[PDB]
Amino acid sequence: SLIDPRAIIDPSARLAADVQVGPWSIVGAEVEIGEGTVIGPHVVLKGPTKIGKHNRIYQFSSVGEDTPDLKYKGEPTRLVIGDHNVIREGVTIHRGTVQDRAETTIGDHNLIMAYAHIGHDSVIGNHCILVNNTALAGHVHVDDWAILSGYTLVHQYCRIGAHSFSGMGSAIGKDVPAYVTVFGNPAEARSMNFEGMRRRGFSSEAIHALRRAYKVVYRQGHTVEEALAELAESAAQFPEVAVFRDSIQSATRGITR
Amino acid sequence: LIDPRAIIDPSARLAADVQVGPWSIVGAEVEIGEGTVIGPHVVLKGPTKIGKHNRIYQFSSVGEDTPDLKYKGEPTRLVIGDHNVIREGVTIHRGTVQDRAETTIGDHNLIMAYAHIGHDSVIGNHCILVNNTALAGHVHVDDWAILSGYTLVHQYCRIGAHSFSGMGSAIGKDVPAYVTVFGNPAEARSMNFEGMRRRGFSSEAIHALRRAYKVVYRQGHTVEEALAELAESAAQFPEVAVFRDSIQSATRGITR
Amino acid sequence: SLIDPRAIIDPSARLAADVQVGPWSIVGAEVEIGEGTVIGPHVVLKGPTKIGKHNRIYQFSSVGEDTPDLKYKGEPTRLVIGDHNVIREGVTIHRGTVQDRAETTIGDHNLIMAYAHIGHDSVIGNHCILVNNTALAGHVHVDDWAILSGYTLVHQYCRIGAHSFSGMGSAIGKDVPAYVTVFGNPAEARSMNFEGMRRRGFSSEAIHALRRAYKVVYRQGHTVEEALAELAESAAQFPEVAVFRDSIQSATRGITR
Ligand SMILES: O=C(Nc1nnn[nH]1)[C@@H]1CN(S(=O)(=O)c2cccc(C(F)(F)F)c2)Cc2ccccc21
Ligand SMILES: O=C(Nc1nnn[nH]1)[C@@H]1CN(S(=O)(=O)c2cccc(C(F)(F)F)c2)Cc2ccccc21
Ligand SMILES: O=C(Nc1nnn[nH]1)[C@@H]1CN(S(=O)(=O)c2cccc(C(F)(F)F)c2)Cc2ccccc21
């Protein structure tokens, strides 16, 4: 059948139609797996965890584990994963902490590559790519279409804006605004993901307004308040520029410069 | 307690309270002490001693041979203390004869996902190795040391008591006790003042250490000039002696 | 017997007579293992894949999985491993893509340490060392005797020259010429692997010629074509200098400086 007899399914666990579990996989108590989701061999799922439809989870992944501690501490804490996600070999995903959200949240159509770490209370949106060995410390918010290149380290509470790009080996300590490309340890803003805008079919008017929006924030010596005021008009014409202005507005503890 | 789908070698030695998850291998000459929980999918190889009330998580390879070419199959050891947590996919290699033929881990150590503890490494107590920390080999980590995620330590380096390394740090030279280091290559920034307050250090002892840092790092002295300047502060404050002693035992230089 | 009864051997799998396979290992369809090869417990082998003779593959390794790269669409691509290779704990090796030569290729006597990654369409030669957590993004050519120390990151299409050395935590966006020593993120050219050359028994005359060849490429203000021209004489005299000159000539992303 679809359920390999060498897998251990806890009596409390809930499996929907067309679910596959490979051999020697543990689907622990309070884990719920959605329609057509494929669990490979040698996977550990721990709950309380909700996984949606048409997901693929590869061998050696630990999905819904507790955040590391010298002692067991703080539950019920949730992990929620949406639909059409690919979680590759040996990925670690921790559930939330009772102190903060009490939930780690992953949306839809995300690709999390081998040995990536998703820390407690982190929130991933849709259509994101975390390349090999990307580590989100915890309480990290990754917005839609963001790409973290291989071995990107993100500090606790940092926001990764929509359509942003972090070069491989980047260590991020401050918010990355929407569309911004960052590199190095510590991470420095370089340009914008113009490549990614074109692959999203952004009007060349929107891309040119986003180029000027970069220069307003990074290049003209403005305060953030002065920048937000200078962007207000562009943000009103282009929803794309508003995503950018909003990412800067939301950064209380400062942006990656 | 011992899951029937685990392979326990005849010559393994497990206390009554020990839990072994399914699909785990307790290899030849593996001692495991009372209260220790071995998760599923764990490979333990010997000769290895594991103390008490330890927790080893799935996909961990504890007590394998180093691939370091200078190792040639000698019966070298791995000792682990008590109340240690070893997380998902941690690799801990046994020692080599060229040193002391032992990798040593003490008590109350938190070793997070995919950390590497190379051959002959000595970790003390209440240490934190965050995800993907790599100790290349012969690395001595002293009590209360914290190495942040993806911290790389070159062979033979000493990580001082209460020292802290920023994430993605690459350490080539000894880190003195209490010192904070960041970047590739690693550079001294300040003292672990949080760590001192964690331990309940006197505001005297913290002020003495704040000064001691300036003597070594900020006053354009040499190491020899600096050691002599500290010797009185060191004699008065056992806390300052830990710092001064870590600089003296640094024969291959300190992280500046 | 040598195949553990808890192992899963696909009917279509071809194992030489003395092949060992540890418990809860998977030898999938169209996987060939040559004589002497030992597979440890908890190993996943997917095909189409050819593993040669006297190889050792450690636990938690995923050898021959599909690349998550979005351009691969389930085409029947290959992985080929030669003889006398050691693959340590948790290594990932993906098969090729039809956009290149539909093959990922490893030669002989290579040491690939724990959690190292070998991306689609990568070509490793002989006597290479990939230290812990080294990652080749894809289409990476590593020539014979190349050392990549721990957590070395290699961008797609980068060529790592013969007897080259990359320091711990290096991030390589451009070709590493043969013999050259690189460090840092981004990677920086800092002289040549003279201790490597003296160890493998290179002549004093050859080492002295490589020393001058280095000055011509890096220290004489020459553009690459001006340099390739000046090396032409010395490359005709010494094979080592030809390998060096050849590595520079075949740089598609430029060279590490
Ligand atoms: O194209 C890109 N270039 C880039 N990275 N950093 N700076 N520039 C990124 C990175 N990659 S990748 O190189 O193929 C890759 C895959 C596995 C492992 C790694 C490694 F670990 F970094 F080595 C890299 C995947 C990817 C997928 C969609 C969009 C952009 C990218
Ligand atoms: O604060 C700290 N390191 C720091 N700060 N600035 N530079 N490096 C360390 C690190 N953390 S962490 O960020 O929550 C964490 C957890 C898992 C993975 C990672 C990652 F892999 F680095 F991304 C980070 C866990 C932790 C727990 C008690 C004491 C100190 C620490
Ligand atoms: O000797 C060397 N020195 C050097 N590397 N980078 N800069 N200097 C390299 C690196 N080493 S290693 O330190 O013993 C080692 C082993 C496992 C893990 C690591 C770590 F992950 F980086 F921490 C390091 C293993 C090794 C083996 C053959 C040839 C050269 C090397």
HEC string of B11-62? CCEECCCCEECCCCEECCCEEECCCCEECCCCEECCCEEECCCCEECCCCEE
Integer Cα distance of A184 and A166 in angstroms: 9
Q: Enumerate residues lining ligand 1, CB below 6 A.
A: A 113, 129, 131-132, 147, 149-151, 167-168; C 117, 119, 135, 137-138, 153, 156
Does residue A165 contact residue A142 with C-beta atoms inside 8 Å?
no
Residue range(s) defining the domain that contains residue C132 = 1-191
Integer Cα distance of A119 and A139 in angstroms: 7
Integer Cα distance of B137 and B102 in angstroms: 11
Residue B254 is classified by DSSP as B
- The answer to whether the Cα torsion of C119, C120, C125, C127 is positive or negative is positive
Look at chain B and count its residues: 256
Helix (H) or strand (E) holding C21: strand C20-21
Place of tokens 């562009």: A234
One domain, residues B224 and B117:
no
Residues with Cβ within 8 Å of C28's Cβ and at least 6 positions away in sequence, in order, are C10, C13, C44, C45, C46, C47, C64
Helix (H) or strand (E) holding B85: strand B85-86
Integer Cα distance of C174 and C257 in angstroms: 9
One domain, residues A186 and A198:
no
Report residue C88 as tokens.
Answer: 């340590």
Helix (H) or strand (E) holding A147: strand A147-148
Of A24, A114, A169, the CB nearest to C117: A114
Residue A67 is classified by DSSP as P
One domain, residues C165 and C227:
no
Q: Both ends of chain C: CA-CA distance in Å?
A: 54
Residues of chain C with Cβ-Cβ distance to A90 below 8 Å are 60, 90, 115
One domain, residues C214 and C125:
no
Look at chain C and count its residues: 257
Output the residue whose Cα is nearest ligand 3's atom 22.
C150
Does residue C133 contact residue B134 with C-beta atoms inside 8 Å?
yes
Does residue C33 contact residue C27 with C-beta atoms inside 8 Å?
yes
Chain A nearest C-alpha distance from C60 (Å): 7
Closest CA to C147 of C103, C200, C104: C200
**SS3 at position C113:** coil
Edge to edge, what strands does the sheet with B43-44 contain? B7-8, B25-26, B43-44, B61-64, B91-93, B116-117, B134-135, B152-153, B170-171
The upper half-sphere exposure of residue C189, i.e. CA atoms within 13 Å in the direction of its Cβ, equals: 20
Q: What is the dihedral of CA B146, B148, B151, B154, to 10 degrees?
A: -10
Residues with Cβ within 8 Å of C208's Cβ and at least 6 positions away in sequence, in order, are none
Closest CA to B78 of B112, B34, B129, B27: B27
Q: Is A135 in the pocket of ligand 2 (CB under 6 A)?
A: yes
Does residue C14 contact residue C32 with C-beta atoms inside 8 Å?
yes
Residue C52 corresponds to which amino acid? G
Burial pattern A235-257, b for ≥16 Cβ within 10 A else e, equals beebebbbbbbbbbbebeeebbe
Does residue C31 contact residue C47 with C-beta atoms inside 8 Å?
yes
Chain B nearest C-alpha distance from A70 (Å): 6
Beta partners for C49? Answer: C31, C79
Query: Burial, B238: exposed, middle or buried (Cβ in 10 Å; 0-12, 13-18, 19+)?
Result: exposed
Integer Cα distance of A91 and A144 in angstroms: 20
Domain closes at, from B190, B220, B248: B190
One domain, residues B255 and B183:
no
Does residue B59 contact residue A62 with C-beta atoms inside 8 Å?
yes
Q: What's the gap between Cα B83 and its chain centre?
A: 14
Residues with Cβ within 8 Å of A66's Cβ and at least 6 positions away in sequence, in order, are A46, A72, A73, A74, A75, A77, A94, A95
Residues with Cβ within 8 Å of B252's Cβ and at least 6 positions away in sequence, in order, are B156, B173, B174
Place of tokens 């955040």: A67
Integer Cα distance of C113 and C133 in angstroms: 7
Integer Cα distance of C142 and C124 in angstroms: 5
Closest CA to C67 of A131, B88, A163, A108: A131
- If one counts every other C-beta atom within 10 angstroms of the C-beta of residue B251, the result is 8
Closest CA to B108 of B57, B145, B134, B71: B145
Burial pattern A126-165, b for ≥16 Cβ within 10 A else e, equals bbbbbbbbbbbbbbbbbbbbbbbbbbbbbbebbbbbbbbb
Residue B65 is classified by DSSP as P
One domain, residues B180 and B234:
no
Chain A nearest C-alpha distance from C141 (Å): 19
- Whether the bond into C177 is cis, omega within 30 of 0: no
One domain, residues A159 and A54:
yes
How many domains are contained in chain B?
2
Integer Cα distance of C257 and C245 in angstroms: 15
> Helices in B132-202 by DSSP H: which ranges?
193-198
Does residue C148 contact residue C160 with C-beta atoms inside 8 Å?
yes
Output the residue whose Cα is nearest ligand 1's atom 9.
A149
In chain C, count of helices (H) and strands (E)?
Answer: 4, 27
Pocket test for ligand 3, best of B154, B157, B173, B184 (most atoms within 8 A of CB): B154
Does residue A87 contact residue A104 with C-beta atoms inside 8 Å?
no
Does residue B205 contact residue B240 with C-beta atoms inside 8 Å?
yes
- Whether the bond into C76 is cis, omega within 30 of 0: no
Does residue C123 contact residue C105 with C-beta atoms inside 8 Å?
yes
Residue B66 is classified by DSSP as P
Degrees (nearest 5) of the Cα angle B87, A105, A181?
90
One domain, residues C99 and C212:
no
Domain closes at, from C161, C191, C221: C191
- Whether the bond into A23 is cis, omega within 30 of 0: no
Does residue A251 contact residue A159 with C-beta atoms inside 8 Å?
yes
Residues of chain C with Cβ-Cβ distance to A185 below 8 Å are 185
Integer Cα distance of B116 and B234 in angstroms: 34
Ligand 3 centre and the CA of A88: distance in Å? 27
Output the residue whose Cα is nearest ligand 3's atom 13.
B136
Report residue A179 as tokens.
Answer: 């569309």
- The answer to whether the Cα torsion of B4, B8, B9, B11 is positive or negative is negative
Q: Both ends of chain A: CA-CA distance in Å?
A: 54
Residues with Cβ within 8 Å of A195's Cβ and at least 6 positions away in sequence, in order, are none
One domain, residues C117 and C221:
no
Q: Enumerate residues lining ligand 3, CB below 6 A.
A: B 68, 116, 118, 134, 136-137, 152, 154-155; C 113, 129, 131-132, 147, 149-151, 167-168
Of A44, A133, A153, the CB nearest to B58: A44
Residue A153 vs residues A10, A119, A179, B146, B235: alpha-carbon distances, Å:
34, 11, 18, 17, 42
Closest CA to B80 of B44, B117, B51: B51
Closest CA to C230 of C215, C211, C240, C250: C215
Helix (H) or strand (E) holding C123: strand C123-124
Residue C148 corresponds to which amino acid? L
Integer Cα distance of A100 and A139 in angstroms: 8
**SS3 at position C198:** helix
Q: Could you please report the per-residue DSSP string of C163-175? A: T-EE-TT-EE-SB
Residue A1 corresponds to which amino acid? S
Q: Both ends of chain B: CA-CA distance in Å?
A: 50
Integer Cα distance of B21 and B40 in angstroms: 4
Residue by residue, what is the 3-state secondary structure of A2-40?
Answer: CECCCCEECCCCEECCCCEECCCCEECCCEEECCCCEEC
One domain, residues B13 and B28:
yes
Residue A225 corresponds to which amino acid? E
Report residue C18 as tokens.
Answer: 């003395």
Residue C235 corresponds to which amino acid? A
Closest CA to C130 of B95, B137, B67: B67
The A-side interface with C (CB below 8 A) comprises 23-24, 41-42, 58-60, 86, 88-90, 111, 113-115, 132-133, 150-151, 168-169, 184-185
B140-147, long-range: CB < 8 A, 24+ apart: B142/B177, B142/B246, B143/B106, B144/B195, B144/B198, B144/B199, B146/B192, B146/B195
Q: What angle separates helix C239-249 from helix C204-218, to the nearest 10 degrees?
A: 30
Burial pattern C224-253, b for ≥16 Cβ within 10 A else e, equals eeebbebbeebbeebebbbbbbbbbeebee
Please, which experimental method was used? X-ray
Does residue B229 contact residue B201 with C-beta atoms inside 8 Å?
no
Residues with Cβ within 8 Å of A182's Cβ and at least 6 positions away in sequence, in order, are A164, A165, A166, A167, A170, A172, A176, A188, A189, A190, A256
Q: C76: alpha, beta or left, given left = phi > 0 and alpha = psi -120 to 50?
A: beta
Domain closes at, from A170, A191, A212: A191
Integer Cα distance of C171 and A18 in angstroms: 42
Residue C138 is classified by DSSP as S
One domain, residues C134 and C203:
no
Place of tokens 């949080």: B194
Residues with Cβ within 8 Å of A179's Cβ and at least 6 positions away in sequence, in order, are A161, A162, A163, A164, A192, A193, A196, A197, A210, A214, A243, A244
Residue C250 corresponds to which amino acid? S
Place of tokens 């109340």: B83
Integer Cα distance of A11 and B52 in angstroms: 31
One domain, residues B142 and B47:
yes
Whether C138 is catalytic: yes
Query: Burial, C45: exposed, middle or buried (Cβ in 10 Å; 0-12, 13-18, 19+)?
Result: buried
Report residue B104 as tokens.
Answer: 């040593």
Integer Cα distance of A235 and A237 in angstroms: 6
